[PDB]
Amino acid sequence: AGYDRHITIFSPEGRLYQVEYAFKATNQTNINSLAVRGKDCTVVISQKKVPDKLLDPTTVSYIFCISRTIGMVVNGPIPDARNAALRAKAEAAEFRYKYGYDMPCDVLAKRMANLSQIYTQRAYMRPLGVILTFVSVDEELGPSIYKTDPAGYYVGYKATATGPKQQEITTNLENHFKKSKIDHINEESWEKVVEFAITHMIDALGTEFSKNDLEVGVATKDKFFTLSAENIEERLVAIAEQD
Amino acid sequence: TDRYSFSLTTFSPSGKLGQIDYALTAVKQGVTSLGIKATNGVVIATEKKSSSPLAMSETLSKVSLLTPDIGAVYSGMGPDYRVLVDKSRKVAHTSYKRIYGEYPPTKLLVSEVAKIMQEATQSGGVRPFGVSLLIAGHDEFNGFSLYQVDPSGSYFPWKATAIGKGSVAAKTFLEKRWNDELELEDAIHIALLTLKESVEGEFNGDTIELAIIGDENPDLLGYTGIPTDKGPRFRKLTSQEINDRLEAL
Amino acid sequence: TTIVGVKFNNGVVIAADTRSTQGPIVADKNCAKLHRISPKIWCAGAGTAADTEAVTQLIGSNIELHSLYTSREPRVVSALQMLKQHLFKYQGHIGAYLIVAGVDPTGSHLFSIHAHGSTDVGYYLSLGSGSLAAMAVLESHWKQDLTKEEAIKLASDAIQAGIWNDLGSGSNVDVCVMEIGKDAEYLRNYLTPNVREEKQKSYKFPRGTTAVLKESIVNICD
Amino acid sequence: FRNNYDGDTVTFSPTGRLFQVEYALEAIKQGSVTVGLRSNTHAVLVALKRNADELSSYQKKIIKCDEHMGLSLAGLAPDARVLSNYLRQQCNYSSLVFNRKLAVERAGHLLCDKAQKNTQSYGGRPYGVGLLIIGYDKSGAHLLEFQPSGNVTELYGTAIGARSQGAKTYLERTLDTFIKIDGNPDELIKAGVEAISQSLRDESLTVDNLSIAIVGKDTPFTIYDGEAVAKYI
Amino acid sequence: GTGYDLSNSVFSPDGRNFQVEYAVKAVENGTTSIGIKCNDGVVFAVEKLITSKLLVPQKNVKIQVVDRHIGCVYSGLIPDGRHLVNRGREEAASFKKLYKTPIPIPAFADRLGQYVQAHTLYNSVRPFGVSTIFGGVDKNGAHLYMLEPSGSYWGYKGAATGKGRQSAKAELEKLVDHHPEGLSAREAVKQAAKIIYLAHEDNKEKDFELEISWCSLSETNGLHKFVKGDLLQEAIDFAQKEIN
Amino acid sequence: SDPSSINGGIVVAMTGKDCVAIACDLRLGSQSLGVSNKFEKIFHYGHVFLGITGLATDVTTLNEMFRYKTNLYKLKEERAIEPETFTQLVSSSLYERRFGPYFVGPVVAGINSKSGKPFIAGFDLIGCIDEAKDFIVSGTASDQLFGMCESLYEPNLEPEDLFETISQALLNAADRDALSGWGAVVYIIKKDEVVKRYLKMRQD
Amino acid sequence: TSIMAVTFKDGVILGADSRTTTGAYIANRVTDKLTRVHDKIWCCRSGSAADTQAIADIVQYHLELYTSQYGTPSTETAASVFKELCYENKDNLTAGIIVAGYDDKNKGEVYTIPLGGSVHKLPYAIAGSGSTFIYGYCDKNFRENMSKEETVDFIKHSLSQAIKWDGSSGGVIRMVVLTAAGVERLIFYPDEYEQL
Amino acid sequence: GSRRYDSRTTIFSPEGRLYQVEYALESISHAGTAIGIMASDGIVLAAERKVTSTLLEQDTSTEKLYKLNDKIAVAVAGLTADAEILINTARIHAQNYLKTYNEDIPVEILVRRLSDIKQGYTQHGGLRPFGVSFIYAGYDDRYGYQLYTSNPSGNYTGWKAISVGANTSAAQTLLQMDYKDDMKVDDAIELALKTLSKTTDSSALTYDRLEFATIRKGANDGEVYQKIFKPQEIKDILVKTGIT
Ligand SMILES: *[C@@](C)(CO)[C@](*)(O)[C@H](CC(C)C)NC(=O)[C@H](CCC(=O)N(C)C)NC(=O)[C@@H](NC(=O)CCCCC)C(C)C
Numbered sequence A: 001a002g003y004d005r006h007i008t009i010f011s012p013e014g015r016l017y018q019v020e021y022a023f024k025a026t027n028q029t030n031i032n033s034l035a036v037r038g039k040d041c042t043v044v045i046s047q048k049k050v051p052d053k054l055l056d057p058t059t060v061s062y063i064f065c066i067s068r069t070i071g072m073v074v075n076g077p078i079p080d081a082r083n084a085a086l087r088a089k090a091e092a093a094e095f096r097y098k099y100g101y102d103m104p105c106d107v108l109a110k111r112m113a114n115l116s117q118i119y120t121q122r123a124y125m126r127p128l129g130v131i132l133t134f135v136s137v138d139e140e141l142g143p144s145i146y147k148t149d150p151a152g153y154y155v156g157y158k159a160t161a162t163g164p165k166q167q168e169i170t171t172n173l174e175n176h177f178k179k180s181k182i183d184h185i186n187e188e189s190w191e192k193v194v195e196f197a198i199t200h201m202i203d204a205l206g207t208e209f210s211k212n213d214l215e216v217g218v219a220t221k222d223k224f225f226t227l228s229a230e231n232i233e234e235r236l237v238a239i240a241e242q243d
Numbered sequence B: 001t002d003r004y005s006f007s008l009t010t011f012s013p014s015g016k017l018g019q020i021d022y023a024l025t026a027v028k029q030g031v032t033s034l035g036i037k038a039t040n041g042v043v044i045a046t047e048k049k050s051s052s053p054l055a056m057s058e059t060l061s062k063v064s065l066l067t068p069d070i071g072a073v074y075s076g077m078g079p080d081y082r083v084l085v086d087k088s089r090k091v092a093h094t095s096y097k098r099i100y101g102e103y104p105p106t107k108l109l110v111s112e113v114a115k116i117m118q119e120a121t122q123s124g125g126v127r128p129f130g131v132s133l134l135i136a137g138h139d140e141f142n143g144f145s146l147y148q149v150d151p152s153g154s155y156f157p158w159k160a161t162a163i164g165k166g167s168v169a170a171k172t173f174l175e176k177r178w179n180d181e182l183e184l185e186d187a188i189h190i191a192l193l194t195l196k197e198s199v200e201g202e203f204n205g206d207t208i209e210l211a212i213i214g215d216e217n218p219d220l221l222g223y224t225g226i227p228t229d230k231g232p233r234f235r236k237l238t239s240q241e242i243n244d245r246l247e248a249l
Numbered sequence C: 001t002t003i004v005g006v007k008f009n010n011g012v013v014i015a016a017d018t019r020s021t022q023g024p025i026v027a028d029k030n031c032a033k034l035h036r037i038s039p040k041i042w043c044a045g046a047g048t049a050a051d052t053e054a055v056t057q058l059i060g061s062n063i064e065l066h067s068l069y070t071s072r073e074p075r076v077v078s079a080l081q082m083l084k085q086h087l088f089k090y091q092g093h094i095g096a097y098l099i100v101a102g103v104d105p106t107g108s109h110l111f112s113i114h115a116h117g118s119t120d121v122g123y124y125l126s127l128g129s130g131s132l133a134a135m136a137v138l139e140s141h142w143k144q145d146l147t148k149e150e151a152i153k154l155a156s157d158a159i160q161a162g163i164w165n166d167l168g169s170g171s172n173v174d175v176c177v178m179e180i181g182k183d184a185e186y187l188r189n190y191l192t193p194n195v196r197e198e199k200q201k202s203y204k205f206p207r208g209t210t211a212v213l214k215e216s217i218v219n220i221c222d
Numbered sequence D: 001f002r003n004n005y006d007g008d009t010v011t012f013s014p015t016g017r018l019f020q021v022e023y024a025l026e027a028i029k030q031g032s033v034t035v036g037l038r039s040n041t042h043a044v045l046v047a048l049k050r051n052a053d054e055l056s057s058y059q060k061k062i063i064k065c066d067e068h069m070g071l072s073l074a075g076l077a078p079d080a081r082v083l084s085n086y087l088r089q090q091c092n093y094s095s096l097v098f099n100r101k102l103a104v105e106r107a108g109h110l111l112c113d114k115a116q117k118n119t120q121s122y123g124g125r126p127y128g129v130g131l132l133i134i135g136y137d138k139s140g141a142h143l144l145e146f147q148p149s150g151n152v153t154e155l156y157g158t159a160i161g162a163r164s165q166g167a168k169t170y171l172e173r174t175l176d177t178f179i180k181i182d183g184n185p186d187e188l189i190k191a192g193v194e195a196i197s198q199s200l201r202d203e204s205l206t207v208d209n210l211s212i213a214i215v216g217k218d219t220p221f222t223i224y225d226g227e228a229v230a231k232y233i
Numbered sequence E: 001g002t003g004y005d006l007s008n009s010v011f012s013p014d015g016r017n018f019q020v021e022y023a024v025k026a027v028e029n030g031t032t033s034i035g036i037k038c039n040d041g042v043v044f045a046v047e048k049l050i051t052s053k054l055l056v057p058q059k060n061v062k063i064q065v066v067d068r069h070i071g072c073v074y075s076g077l078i079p080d081g082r083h084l085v086n087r088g089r090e091e092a093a094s095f096k097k098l099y100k101t102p103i104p105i106p107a108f109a110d111r112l113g114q115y116v117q118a119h120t121l122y123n124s125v126r127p128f129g130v131s132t133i134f135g136g137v138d139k140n141g142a143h144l145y146m147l148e149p150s151g152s153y154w155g156y157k158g159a160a161t162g163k164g165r166q167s168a169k170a171e172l173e174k175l176v177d178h179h180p181e182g183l184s185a186r187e188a189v190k191q192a193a194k195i196i197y198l199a200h201e202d203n204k205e206k207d208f209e210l211e212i213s214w215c216s217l218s219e220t221n222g223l224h225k226f227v228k229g230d231l232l233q234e235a236i237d238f239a240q241k242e243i244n
Numbered sequence F: 001s002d003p004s005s006i007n008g009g010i011v012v013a014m015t016g017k018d019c020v021a022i023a024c025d026l027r028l029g030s031q032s033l034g035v036s037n038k039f040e041k042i043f044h045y046g047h048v049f050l051g052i053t054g055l056a057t058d059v060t061t062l063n064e065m066f067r068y069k070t071n072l073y074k075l076k077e078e079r080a081i082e083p084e085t086f087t088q089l090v091s092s093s094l095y096e097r098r099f100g101p102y103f104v105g106p107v108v109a110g111i112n113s114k115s116g117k118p119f120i121a122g123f124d125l126i127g128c129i130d131e132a133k134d135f136i137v138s139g140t141a142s143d144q145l146f147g148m149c150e151s152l153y154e155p156n157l158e159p160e161d162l163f164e165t166i167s168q169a170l171l172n173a174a175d176r177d178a179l180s181g182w183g184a185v186v187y188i189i190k191k192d193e194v195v196k197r198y199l200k201m202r203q204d
Numbered sequence G: 001t002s003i004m005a006v007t008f009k010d011g012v013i014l015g016a017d018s019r020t021t022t023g024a025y026i027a028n029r030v031t032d033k034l035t036r037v038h039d040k041i042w043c044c045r046s047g048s049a050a051d052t053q054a055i056a057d058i059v060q061y062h063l064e065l066y067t068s069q070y071g072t073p074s075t076e077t078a079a080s081v082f083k084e085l086c087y088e089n090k091d092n093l094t095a096g097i098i099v100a101g102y103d104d105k106n107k108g109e110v111y112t113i114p115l116g117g118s119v120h121k122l123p124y125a126i127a128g129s130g131s132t133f134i135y136g137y138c139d140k141n142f143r144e145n146m147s148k149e150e151t152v153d154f155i156k157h158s159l160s161q162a163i164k165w166d167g168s169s170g171g172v173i174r175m176v177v178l179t180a181a182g183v184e185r186l187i188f189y190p191d192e193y194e195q196l
Numbered sequence H: 001g002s003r004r005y006d007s008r009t010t011i012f013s014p015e016g017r018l019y020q021v022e023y024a025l026e027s028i029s030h031a032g033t034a035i036g037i038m039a040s041d042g043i044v045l046a047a048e049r050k051v052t053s054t055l056l057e058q059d060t061s062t063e064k065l066y067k068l069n070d071k072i073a074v075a076v077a078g079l080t081a082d083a084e085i086l087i088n089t090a091r092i093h094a095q096n097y098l099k100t101y102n103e104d105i106p107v108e109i110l111v112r113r114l115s116d117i118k119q120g121y122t123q124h125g126g127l128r129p130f131g132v133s134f135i136y137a138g139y140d141d142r143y144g145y146q147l148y149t150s151n152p153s154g155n156y157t158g159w160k161a162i163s164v165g166a167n168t169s170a171a172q173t174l175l176q177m178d179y180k181d182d183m184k185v186d187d188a189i190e191l192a193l194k195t196l197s198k199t200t201d202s203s204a205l206t207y208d209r210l211e212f213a214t215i216r217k218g219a220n221d222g223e224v225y226q227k228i229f230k231p232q233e234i235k236d237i238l239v240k241t242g243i244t
């Protein structure tokens, strides 16, 4: 009648309250993110909020380069976020050394989601208060988005969004794929896919963005990279010409 | 450091093992899955409950192959199932195939899985697994078999059964329809009808996962040469193969 | 042993003899030196017989579990990395010499591994005591852009060089063909050029030739 | 309030306090008073010893660590035995490996770091003793104060123990005097006697009651007891 | 029922680690300290509460050095800050051992960061009771960091923590605006003395000592070095002339 | 010095029309000293017969071991071990001691109770499976046996016939070996019944 | 083996023969002894085939992990990793390695790591059994800040002498060019270099 | 730390009772009833499964009866999951014995060892006890036919007739009323059925709910034989006694 809420053991109802409270933690940063697939690319967009005038904007990031091909975006507090990243990087390097080929997106995801499950069963480990979104252009499955949570769950997406205002972005995208019929963004270049993602972020959230409000990651054939404030700026000049 | 070297499932005054009772509650909350055994095959089926209209249902397999002749399905917590499947595959090699050069019989791989779940009942600092499994398989000496494995670690052989949400109403539906002279095509027919009572939404090969343990599939082996190798008996049906039996249902 | 591996335009072929020895005496006149790792990755083994058979199985077992974990077809480079790291670990005390080849979603591959764990890559390779007899044939008849049938011929010819010319090689020729778009075909006893000639006499003894001291029935029941 | 946050040292109070550490501090306040004081030439320890009966012995408060360094204790005696021993090894190691007399400033950093590891890990209780460490290394005379929280402080003079606030105001008042006592050990010991009696209340300090230690330039660390301290009464 | 604040690794129903927030309180109770990043280096300073006339001047050092190019100062529980530097010192030496090159500041930050996050993961450990301000000069320019008990760390133009964190930040933000084109290494030292003196209003009952250090490509040759004698007296005299 | 050469002893297995035969000599010696004329080298676990030559302590151990392992197998599987499967359990068991092996030369013989197929197999000391359709040989006079079988053997022999052939193979091979002989025994195996005969040979 | 790496005005070039032997039998005549540990850091392998492969695989791993966290490693760092593996396991390895890499700040850099596990930074380095014969040639020919054409010639002439005299060296001459422009692979066949 | 969540499974009550042993024994009193009766010419084991379904498979099922050995067998009452862990050591133990002494393990030595494993979880390790009671039925050249019982406490005893599981008090009195020493096996077969038939909480006692075994030495083979009754055989014997 008390401690079934403090460690990772079942409640009378069959629930794990420490897992449920971990999901709640992922929204502490008040930052939304989304991910879409192009013809032969994948784009992650996350909000960049730097509320303190004493910070260095370039050090404030929730997007990580896990490997040469895989990138990861995190919804959650930064120390848990950086924890998860370090492991993902180590897990990636080790896979390549052991198996002789770069770790796929869906495989890395499964791994990190298997680890998350462990913290859900063993009592001395707490779950991490983070939702991890991995992206790549897999040499077998093409553009890929895979997302893991504190429950240990993971699934592949056509597109996804995460954060406090997730449902706004989600319904917006769902309506686009019912309209377009296909399950990706029909565009040749990644530049016009980054534009699409920012456009649908603005149209779903209802807020305009400057070069410092955004943080972008792009996955192409054999390369994941993050855009500078300047590349985003170039991308924001392009959206403000069609409208 | 791990200071949890003591049991987390203990006996309550009444004789109940609290954590197991609760784990079973989680299994009732999970999506319905079932299994039926014909004279010349076994069928396992479940419903793909989608987390978001944006998620791709193919990337999540609720039905899994353990050995070429053995398949598994579940009701309950997905992540716990996943890691169980990983361990179930490994144990089939380490404790059997690396010793005898052949795959474990259905009853013995079940037995190994049961044990893995039992230890989660007694070891220091762990909760039980929150899943019930259905294992369907074939071996040369036993024929076709279907087993149910509970969070406690217990296992029962079944002619037919279901687990999860509508398991009560589904078991009643199966009792009406099952006999000892069923062909495998019939068992699939019943399986689809039994699963229709559980599903409110779309009922097609896109939202329903189904696999069989039937004849040897020579064209699924990947190689020709060895006459004693005739291919796996586990076959997962495609979205299209399911719709073929739903058009006349 | 003699073992060879030849790349052609649309895949790779590997071949081996079937002689097994214990000193100067032939242990098995027809053993299989070709090993399935996965359905589309096969392996030729030379050296310590139990060493090749065991390292083949260990890795094959690991590769199967990997393929399930990842939901992907196994790659030849994976099997290559696992074998070499294992062999290296044992500093050559596991005396397995391997030609590993096959097809995967990244194309066709042909490699070789030594007991100490080093790996070579090539279009044509051979190992074993019959290595030199076979390699001489390969260096003489190999050309680029071989058809499947030309690759079989060459690999088969190379194994024959070992069978006739090397004492640590003989009996039959086992072949396996791995093609890009097809299911790999295993040709056990592809050639049988060493059929024993019919005996001159029969040595069936007239019943009662052997003197018997004691007779009984054995029991198996329970 | 306090009830729930004092079970172990692993737990923080809502205010940000570590109660187990703070109760360990209380064991020092119950301990017998001891005092330190230095000049540029010499560093001095004066300690009041506490007996159980008039049939028991007065338990010793001063320990040698090496030929240039030692300390006085207030609180749990076994914990002083553990901690003084450590510094004896750390002094020993510095000598054998580096042919070096381990400096008193690093003495404190080692005690600070050892004490801290007990305040963060489950199971381990804090230490229950305060230490007044006097030394003479390659940079003159030093005196240190040790609290089982970890806080080590280099001072000219200080006191710990029961009623030790009286002695601490005295040394605070007569700074300009005792710091200039260079070259005359006696008039520094006699300055430390007049310090400790500021913390007396009930008893008059006797010949088997008083314990004095001195280190310095031309003097090594030594212990004075019995009729050898009779002159300072 | 609750009791969510009794065990470290536990999450509250709102998704918080109450034990960490309780450690923050220990830091807030601690003595104030800052860091000023400049156009080629970093300047650290800190308050030293003089309790008695019996505390020896210049003797109770608080700013620590990791390696030769990094320096750290902290508010909160000192022994915890010492422990964090011992780990910092090992971590940097291990990096120099394998990679030859001295550890980059961003690399060193994550090292302390992953170590502090580790102590919010298990019930058998207590979270660190320190905020730490650290940084230095590496292969590409200067870096300044601030590390929280949660494991959070970011790069800062100016960092401040402890008792007088309010007064400091308010004064730090005027600097970032009045000097957008970078501040010099020399200027920052003087300006660090002022910030400490003005954040001493928060405790103006007890006298205090001033302790400053700097790491600067052109002034200290990229090595961490304390401020002594004539430069130190120069910085005091600037604070006195600004406070009046 | 050579552990395979201290105690002596030989074993031979041979297949025929719906039958297998396994045979051994009774000698246990230490170098020149003949010690026991009773030491049998064949064992069975259900219908699966195993023969072992080599260092006799290892023979004795590996027996006890495979009884231990087959007993546990039959209890879990609820069925007797089969020759094909047993062969595999012998290989993995030997290779487990790869770098500190048992100094033995195991031989497996029997009839698959399900398919009715005759089966024999041979092993080296580290578990390399040597599967043959005709005959398998083991022990200190394997050379003499290899020559005997390769000459005397013809396929599809009848139970009575096979007995004559295998016995004459073993006997003449044991008489050219100083460390084999002293008696002998021959198991004739059918799908239903098993017949065990002791042979009359030289005792020198 | 015969192997070398040479710094020049624009960057650095690595060169090797392609022969692996077991005694007097050539196991492989088309070996690539030039191995990538990072995008623009490569190495020259001599000694045990098994040992040098196993070492290089680990270095590539370490630098891959370094890149995830700290960015592009310096050539000096790549040397340190090799040094650590070779020195600390000196008793169990027969491996002599030349590390070469192009940094955009440091231009061209060559580090040599012989049997001991010691590290030496040089303008150019030669190693392998065949290198002994070309000590005189290289010392009298090498100049600092040569052109690409000039350096390719210098390596081509040197390794041809090594191959000419040393029975343990032969096959083709492989080179790898490391500059700001990227990575270039060069191959020279017997009929070309024997005639020099 | 973890101290808070420790049930302390191996402690005494103020009364001097082991909490967990008692609560586990309470668990067993709910499980299906098992009966063992030993006669002059053999031993009988029977059990009742809790209620189940028609769908349930009866041919492949053997859930409460187990073969430990060539000559030893067991009936289970409690968690099957727990029971199999112990049954597997019991099997290993017997084999170890056989490997050592070249003789089949005496029935008591086997029983004692399991009961010692059980006693373990009672005294150290802080783990829960096995929720299992065993009846043992075996033969050896020393005591002949033997019948033992062991419960979670690690205590074992020898019996002429015994029951574990549900309604043992009711079942013990009924045996205590109809058992005699000069009993034939087939007389003891009838008794076990009648006893279960009178304590059954279900409407009727059918074959699909029963498991049956005999460890009878053959009145012609002259050696010990084990027999686990297959559904059809139980179906036949149930009509004989008069239960249809
Ligand atoms: C060629 C026939 C060359 O001999 C092949 O490489 C062949 C490999 C296949 C897989 C059979 N090798 C053998 O048959 C080896 C040759 C003996 C050998 O390599 N040595 C010189 C030691 N033979 C064996 O593997 C045989 N085993 C043994 O002799 C026992 C070795 C124990 C090692 C401690 C078996 C065929 C019986």
Ligand SMILES: *[C@@](C)(CO)[C@](*)(O)[C@H](CC(C)C)NC(=O)[C@H](CCC(=O)N(C)C)NC(=O)[C@@H](NC(=O)CCCCC)C(C)C
Residues within 6 Å of the ligand: C114, C116, C118, G001, G002, G019, G020, G021, G022, G023, G027, G033, G045, G046, G047, G048, G049, G050, G052, G094, G128, G129, G168, G169
């Ligand atoms: C030159 C060919 C001169 O030896 C090179 O250094 C070359 C190095 C490249 C990177 C492979 N080395 C070899 O080819 C070596 C030569 C033997 C050696 O240096 N060792 C210390 C072993 N060959 C091998 O490494 C071969 N393996 C062996 O175990 C050598 C067998 C020698 C007989 C005992 C492999 C190429 C298979």
